Amino acid sequence: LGFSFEFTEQQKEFQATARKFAREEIIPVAAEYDKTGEYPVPLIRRAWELGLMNTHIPENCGGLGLGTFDACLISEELAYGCTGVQTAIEGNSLGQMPIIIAGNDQQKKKYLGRMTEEPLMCAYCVTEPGAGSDVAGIKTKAEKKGDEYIINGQKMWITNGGKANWYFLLARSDPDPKAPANKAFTGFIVEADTPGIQIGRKELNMGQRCSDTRGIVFEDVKVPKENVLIGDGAGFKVAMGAFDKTRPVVAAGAVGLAQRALDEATKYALERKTFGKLLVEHQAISFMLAEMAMKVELARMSYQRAAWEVDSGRRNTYYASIAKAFAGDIANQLATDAVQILGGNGFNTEYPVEKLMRDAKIYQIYEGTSQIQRLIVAREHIDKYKN
Amino acid sequence: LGFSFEFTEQQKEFQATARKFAREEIIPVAAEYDKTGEYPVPLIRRAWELGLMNTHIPENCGGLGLGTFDACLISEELAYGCTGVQTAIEGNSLGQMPIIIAGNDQQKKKYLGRMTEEPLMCAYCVTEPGAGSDVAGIKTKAEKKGDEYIINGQKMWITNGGKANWYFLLARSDPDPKAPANKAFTGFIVEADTPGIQIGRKELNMGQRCSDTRGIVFEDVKVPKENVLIGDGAGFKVAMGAFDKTRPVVAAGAVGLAQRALDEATKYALERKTFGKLLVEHQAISFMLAEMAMKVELARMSYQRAAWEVDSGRRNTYYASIAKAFAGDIANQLATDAVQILGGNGFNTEYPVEKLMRDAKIYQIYEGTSQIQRLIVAREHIDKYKN
Amino acid sequence: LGFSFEFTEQQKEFQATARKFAREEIIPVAAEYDKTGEYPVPLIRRAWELGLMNTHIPENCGGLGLGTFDACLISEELAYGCTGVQTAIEGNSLGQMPIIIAGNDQQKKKYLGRMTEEPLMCAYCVTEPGAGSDVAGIKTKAEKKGDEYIINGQKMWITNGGKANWYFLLARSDPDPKAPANKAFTGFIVEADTPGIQIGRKELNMGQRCSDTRGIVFEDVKVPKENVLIGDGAGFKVAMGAFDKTRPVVAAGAVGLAQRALDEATKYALERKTFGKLLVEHQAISFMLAEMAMKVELARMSYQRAAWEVDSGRRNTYYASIAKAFAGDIANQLATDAVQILGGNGFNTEYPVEKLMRDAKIYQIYEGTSQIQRLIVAREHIDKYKN
Amino acid sequence: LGFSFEFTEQQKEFQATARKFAREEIIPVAAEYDKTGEYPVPLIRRAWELGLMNTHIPENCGGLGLGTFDACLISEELAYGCTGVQTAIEGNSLGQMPIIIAGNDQQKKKYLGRMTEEPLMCAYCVTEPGAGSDVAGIKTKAEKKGDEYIINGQKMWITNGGKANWYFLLARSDPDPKAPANKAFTGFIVEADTPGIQIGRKELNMGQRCSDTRGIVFEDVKVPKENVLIGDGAGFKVAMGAFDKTRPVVAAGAVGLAQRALDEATKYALERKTFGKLLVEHQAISFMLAEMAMKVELARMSYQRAAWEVDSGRRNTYYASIAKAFAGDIANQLATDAVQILGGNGFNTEYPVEKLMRDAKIYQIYEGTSQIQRLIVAREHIDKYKN
Numbered sequence A, B, C, D: 001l002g003f004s005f006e007f008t009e010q011q012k013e014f015q016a017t018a019r020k021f022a023r024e025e026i027i028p029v030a031a032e033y034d035k036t037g038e039y040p041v042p043l044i045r046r047a048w049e050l051g052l053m054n055t056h057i058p059e060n061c062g063g064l065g066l067g068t069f070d071a072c073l074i075s076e077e078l079a080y081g082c083t084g085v086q087t088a089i090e091g092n093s094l095g096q097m098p099i100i101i102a103g104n105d106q107q108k109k110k111y112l113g114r115m116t117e118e119p120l121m122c123a124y125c126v127t128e129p130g131a132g133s134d135v136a137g138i139k140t141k142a143e144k145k146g147d148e149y150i151i152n153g154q155k156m157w158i159t160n161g162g163k164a165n166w167y168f169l170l171a172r173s174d175p176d177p178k179a180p181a182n183k184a185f186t187g188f189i190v191e192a193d194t195p196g197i198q199i200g201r202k203e204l205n206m207g208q209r210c211s212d213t214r215g216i217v218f219e220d221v222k223v224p225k226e227n228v229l230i231g232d233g234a235g236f237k238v239a240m241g242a243f244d245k246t247r248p249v250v251a252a253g254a255v256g257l258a259q260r261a262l263d264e265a266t267k268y269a270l271e272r273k274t275f276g277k278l279l280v281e282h283q284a285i286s287f288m289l290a291e292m293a294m295k296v297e298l299a300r301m302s303y304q305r306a307a308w309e310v311d312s313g314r315r316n317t318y319y320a321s322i323a324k325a326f327a328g329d330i331a332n333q334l335a336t337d338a339v340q341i342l343g344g345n346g347f348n349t350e351y352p353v354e355k356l357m358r359d360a361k362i363y364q365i366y367e368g369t370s371q372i373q374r375l376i377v378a379r380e381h382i383d384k385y386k387n
């Protein structure tokens, strides 16, 4: 009962750890894993040791039991260091959410608990060749063959999909094309080692080069029936409800990117002399920095509201789509403006902002592109007006 | 103590009151008062009587002793009804602020007390014909003369002048030009009845026609020395302080208007059809709307954060300027979009959206133009990195 | 053969006549006409005298016989004075176009010829209270009844409506709803003094208040078939076809207003100072004028290009819509920035910039809303790639 | 004489030749060169062979004797393939520009003549690590010693730096700091293979990774008197001079990549369907294309105007500065939209769009940043309002 913008001693302690870790382990090696292309294996390890991975796993399963808000503050900090490794570890939680919300004790313990004992990854396999933003356009089919299920399809752009222990897998179990999404799709927690799982090579993408990404072909995969999340019929509802406590964490990573961009940009403008004065003394630049600051400022509050909304038992879907779009956009503007303020050196590879720009782009694409996000916001908006 | 984006019960009541009143009373007459431009007397009265006026006066002087956050919820609702009115009511709290923050109980009891017993209006006189934004250079003379001061200057655009019982005045004392703003001025209370004062005519502006914005000159106005606010010099430090508390409320004032524009566009979008499809069914109108809502939700948070910050004790200068600038910038955006949504009708006077566009402009102008706001934002921001 | 951004001596002098008139006779009275909302008859006939009216009438009907390029040119000048009066003039060319392109020697000499010898006004009746952007959705009836057509419907927002000698009118001639618009409507020439025509009440809008806009109720208005265009059914073609020769001049209208803004804004920037340095010295304001300058130079060429295109006998459509889309949008952006430059003053009625803010708006709404301008351009652009 | 947007049959040839080359030869090899970051030697000689490099060298030196308007013409088509390869080409015209406009006969035949018979390269040395935008701030010295000038200092970001056969070198001659720039710098023609020239490592930047941009240091580079452009003092003059011819050409570059990005995004929108329909059918995507199309056309008219002015014997600094300013900005908006329309695939290195977004940024940095472009435009525009 009363608005508050002050964290908790527990929450502050977190942001303190994450900060220290990012600024002191990730940043100093942020460039290498970007150049080299390789997976940030050890940093994944360190985060695990520092408890900054798999925050949401229910306490009973030994998981820390931290809410969406905590995930968002911790994530933003890591993102400040590198969105590559940040996204890498956020891959897990993304793929775990479906289980965490649709799982029964058995499913949850036998799968979450493993990550509890050892630093193992997991991926969210759903997006594929002709259906990305259009979730209900998946062709991967799941045919139940009595005892257990048979999977035959292909996925694409799966984060940490080549380093995952198990994958969340969506599929269509209703053959009739006109079979509605609420009853045509079915999900299956599916271990990796399952034969018939051929995984592609590391895709060369223009950013978040240390992040692991590739495709997967699931031809004649025998999925053990007990793994089917809620049961044949409810797959779509699961996946959709999962990221409601995910997108806010996504935005958190983007605003973390905006922040770094702003931090490197302001520092440079403070010492670069042009036309007898520090860049900051040039009103154009001053304005550039101010607006940049209010964008990062507004983006933080945009996710903090969505995290809190779900954390207080509500469907943050509306605000979730707000934070996601705003952060996703301003992330992109601040990066470029930062590269802009740095000048030639900004375009230079021996400088930070170069990477910051190429990375930010992805925030307007995965987990709801700018377009579809605005489609959801209006959907909810308009619905609060009709009868 | 953790974040909370949930009001306090008491607040919900005010909210409903400010609302009920605005939607059931201000609205039906907002256009008559726009057409005729006549001061909204019956409305302000009913506001004071309904208790949505002079909220910041402490319980001591027999006032509601309300904080800025509370004030903002109230103003943001009354604004949705008609900012022309909302401003007339606000000008009171704005002109009383300097006293409320820097006045001795003798002054407070006297001047703030009367405000409570009889519905009155006060004014904030600072801006002069050739001196606005640059407050540190308003040239109105105030000369020491025993137990009083003589004032010879000129103001322009006083909100509520011409209908004010008493004025808050910023005047230059130290005649020496090398005198830092700091000590250069001296602000005090001036009763309107004091001979020497000339009230100019109501300036006709584009929007917020019913507010009383007019000229005024002080031709050898005698202010008894007790009426001063702190001392010779303190002036610049007084009026300047009114902003920490007034600024957020102006943002709330913009947000209210934004909400009005939005509501109007959306209602129409759900009825008007073009090419066998409701306007809302066109992916372009839906996009416009998602961005309209995205703007307000964010803007709202921007001001609340500010109001809270100052109320929790810490300086909200950085946050206040963010809300003023942003809200002021989007309120105009939304306004023009609302007109566009209502097409031809939009440009017509027998529709709300058109009026909104005219009113909105002032939010990007008074209480520091958006340009100067960013000067502050960049100021507070860059200073952090230089500590 | 190659590119040339040079004018001809003839053009050069049209422009000069245009300017003198706009800057000497229109400009002074402009504001007075805006306040009253009165129809500017004096100027209308003065233009008619000076030949800055009805320049598309072929030299055989006693007209100037000028193309679209020379028209836009003249238009920008008048617009600069006031778009309210300019629209009142250009509105004639709109009602004339369908006759100029599709009329026949007998019709043209009768309905264009009377414009030559007298300062007569004429309108363009198409839009209906429930149809505007969706031309094909109009319901004004017109059915063969002997040797004349019987018209029964209502038109809305007709510029020059209550001041027109005759009107161009689009009516649904085929009762069968599945009648393809491309062969479903019929355009006629309807003398206003024809019984059954009830010219509606003068409407009141935000801007362009002196333009005599109002709806018409065609009550069993009987028009001879001799006034039909090239046939029953071809009316839609005439409507859509006239646009190609009218959109460029409407874009010039916007650019004219845009130049007035950049002038009042820049001129103030030179005599107004704040914080010691003139406004035009403050880097942000310099950047405002810079952005304002760019927006106009391009919009000018946009409409110029489009005019030339059609003048060279090509398909126009793709360039003209780009013009109207851009010119319409930037105009609003300049008129608004102009007000902001003059701060408190620019918002006041005693100032020229404020009026422009109201005017600018219709350049996004009327004669092809910005949204459909984009739709049109999208249709053309993509067609270059589809097979 | 009247306006014209028609090409001379001769220009239609240079275009068709350039389009043929750049699309059938640059485009394929392109991707590789960016990944490998290797100089496009093979492609360079090919252009030289087609006679569309050095277009500006006068006919008396065996050059083509082409104007700015014809260089841009060809340049865009060359850029459409790869601005990396094209920038490397423009490096020559740039190093050559100062000598084409300010070198005597013996100089023009000594240095231009060679580029005519052997496909050599040249470079432009002005920028210093401590100063680019602030040209008057370069610290390189020019000690007059007998029949030579001793160059001492460093240059940075020199395109063709290590591959160059000779460079144009601006430098400070008069040691007095209070020397007004316009008569304090001296431009030289320094032969690459001189004793005190030490190049340096190829700078790996985010974009245009096949054109070699390097730093370089001069340690007592005796330059003979014979190779000064106009004379001591006349360096700043001749330097500023060049920018007028070159500006439209760099704008041409940007506008080039813009259409590349616009074509790619459109070709994709016609093959990718989502939610039962190609992207071109969703208003959102379509609206992007329209606005993308508009900008490209206006940018085209941006540089074409700027090129025509200069070639007509007019001071194009005004239009040339809006051309580079605008074309640079929309090139960067397009590159990021193209990627967006191609979604996840757009972010994949295996697709062209991501490669455009990278090379695109440099257009808002080099040859004068968007900021100084606004300054010059604001500065060029204000002169028209004082006298």
Ligand SMILES: Cc1cc2nc3c(=O)[nH]c(=O)nc-3n(C[C@H](O)[C@H](O)[C@H](O)COP(=O)(O)OP(=O)(O)OC[C@H]3O[C@@H](n4cnc5c(N)ncnc54)[C@H](O)[C@@H]3O)c2cc1C
Pocket (backbone or CB within 6 Å): A091, A123, A124, A125, A126, A127, A128, A130, A131, A132, A133, A134, A156, A157, A158, A159, A160, A205, A208, A211, A213, A362, A365, A366, A367, A368, A369, A370, A371, A372, D272, D274, D275, D279, D282, D284, D285, D340, D341, D342, D343, D344, D345, D347
């Ligand atoms: C590094 C990386 C990591 C990713 N990680 C994952 C992951 O871990 N798991 C996973 O399952 N997926 C992941 N993805 C995939 C990503 O989530 C999808 O590509 C995203 O959904 C966008 O869809 P698309 O490109 O297939 O959709 P497309 O529809 O092909 O999107 C392309 C464009 O079309 C527009 N568009 C489409 N439909 C509409 C419409 N109806 N209205 C308006 N505009 C429309 C889109 O907004 C976008 O601008 C990742 C991608 C990358 C590159």
Ligand SMILES: Cc1cc2nc3c(=O)[nH]c(=O)nc-3n(C[C@H](O)[C@H](O)[C@H](O)COP(=O)(O)OP(=O)(O)OC[C@H]3O[C@@H](n4cnc5c(N)ncnc54)[C@H](O)[C@@H]3O)c2cc1C
Pocket (backbone or CB within 6 Å): B124, B125, B126, B127, B128, B130, B131, B132, B133, B134, B156, B157, B158, B159, B205, B213, B362, B365, B366, B367, B368, B369, B370, B371, B372, C272, C274, C275, C279, C282, C284, C285, C340, C341, C342, C343, C344, C345, C347, C348
């Ligand atoms: C209806 C209305 C009510 C008002 N009520 C009050 C009131 O109660 N009390 C009061 O004291 N005043 C009041 N004002 C005046 C208002 O406070 C001033 O309008 C505003 O603070 C500054 O405007 P000006 O006209 O003085 O602007 P100016 O002093 O002319 O300067 C503003 C213009 O220049 C720009 N600018 C100025 N300096 C800089 C700079 N250094 N850098 C960049 N840009 C700069 C601004 O962005 C804008 O373009 C009111 C105005 C209106 C229209």
Ligand SMILES: Cc1cc2nc3c(=O)[nH]c(=O)nc-3n(C[C@H](O)[C@H](O)[C@H](O)COP(=O)(O)OP(=O)(O)OC[C@H]3O[C@@H](n4cnc5c(N)ncnc54)[C@H](O)[C@@H]3O)c2cc1C
Pocket (backbone or CB within 6 Å): B272, B274, B275, B279, B282, B283, B284, B285, B340, B341, B342, B343, B344, B345, B347, C091, C123, C124, C125, C126, C127, C131, C132, C133, C134, C156, C157, C158, C159, C160, C205, C208, C213, C362, C365, C366, C367, C368, C369, C370, C371, C372
């Ligand atoms: C002062 C004035 C004078 C006029 N004079 C004339 C005149 O002389 N003669 C005449 O015949 N008409 C005239 N008009 C009418 C004018 O052309 C219409 O106002 C215009 O066509 C659109 O307004 P509407 O109300 O019909 O738009 P609506 O049909 O109400 O459209 C409303 C909104 O929805 C958007 N929209 C519509 N369809 C789509 C879609 N498919 N996809 C996406 N967005 C869409 C529109 O862009 C607009 O924003 C005038 C209008 C005004 C304001």
Ligand SMILES: Cc1cc2nc3c(=O)[nH]c(=O)nc-3n(C[C@H](O)[C@H](O)[C@H](O)COP(=O)(O)OP(=O)(O)OC[C@H]3O[C@@H](n4cnc5c(N)ncnc54)[C@H](O)[C@@H]3O)c2cc1C
Pocket (backbone or CB within 6 Å): A272, A274, A275, A279, A282, A283, A284, A285, A340, A341, A342, A343, A344, A345, A347, D123, D124, D125, D126, D127, D129, D130, D131, D132, D133, D134, D156, D157, D158, D159, D160, D205, D213, D362, D365, D366, D367, D368, D369, D370, D371, D372
């Ligand atoms: C790939 C590449 C190729 C190049 N090729 C060449 C070449 O062949 N030859 C050559 O001689 N140089 C070349 N350069 C250098 C390039 O022209 C400069 O880097 C560019 O002018 C920016 O100057 P800077 O990097 O020193 O910017 P800085 O001046 O260090 O700072 C620039 C930043 O601050 C802003 N800023 C600066 N002054 C002001 C002001 N007064 N008001 C407002 N904002 C301001 C700028 O707009 C930008 O945002 C090249 C650079 C690159 C990266």
